[PDB]
């Protein structure tokens, strides 16, 4: 544009959006599991992923992926939800923090223990 055009109007800047908006800028949130179900990945991936419908304290519905081998989650279980989205799964943009509140650590883990909330073996 011309200098006169920019004087008249100017430039416009647009703020970005959060990748995980249901956290409300909190690093984690507390929630209650509505339904703990199993889902299918996209076309090039075949598995049975474990997902949970979680009602956060700020009255928001989220789909949170439960990581690790096996879980003890059921309905009406208090869990901690953090950010992070799985690629093949569509609409699942949150993770359950293992080893906190109701959800326990992954049993039998020896490597990457801190990512799955597993205590150091004796």
């Amino acid at each position: 544009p011309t200098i006169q055009q920019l004087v008249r109007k100017g430039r416009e800047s647009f703020a970005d959006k959060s990748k995980s908006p249901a956290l409300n800028s909190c690093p984690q949130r507390r929630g209650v599991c509505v339904r703990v179900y199993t889902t299918t990945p996209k076309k090039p991936n075949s598995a049975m992923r474990k997902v949970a419908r979680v009602r956060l304290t700020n009255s928001k519905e989220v789909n949170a992926y439960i990581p690790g081998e096996g879980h003890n989650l059921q309905e009406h279980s208090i869990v901690l939800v953090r950010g992070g989205r799985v690629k093949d799964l569509p609409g699942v943009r949150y993770h359950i923090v293992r080893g906190t509140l109701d959800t326990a650590g992954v049993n039998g883990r020896t490597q990457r223990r801190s990512k799955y909330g597993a205590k150091r073996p004796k």
Binding site: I3, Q4, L6, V7
Partner: protein, 81 residues
């Protein structure tokens, strides 16, 4: 030894008031961002006891105490008609 009250030079824009006139002072300066020199004006309200000013005359005004609600200037001299 006075403290040199503010003074302005402007052009009369209205005189349809009892002993009060409107003086428009215009100037140019660069834009804070784009650097182009732009025009802006500022209006005033001055006291003229003798009502000796018309419209468009170039006048000089001085800052005074509040003489009314939004009237803080007086007419010192007339430079042009």
């Amino acid at each position: 030894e006075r403290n040199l009250r503010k003074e302005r030079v402007g052009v009369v824009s209205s005189n349809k008031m009892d002993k009060t006139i409107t003086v428009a002072v215009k100037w140019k300066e660069k834009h804070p961002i784009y650097g182009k020199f732009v025009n802006k004006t500022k209006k005033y309200h001055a006291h003229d006891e003798k009502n000796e000013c018309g419209i468009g005359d170039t006048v000089r005004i001085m800052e005074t105490r509040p003489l009314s609600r939004t009237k803080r200037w007086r007419l010192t001299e007339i430079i042009e008609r």
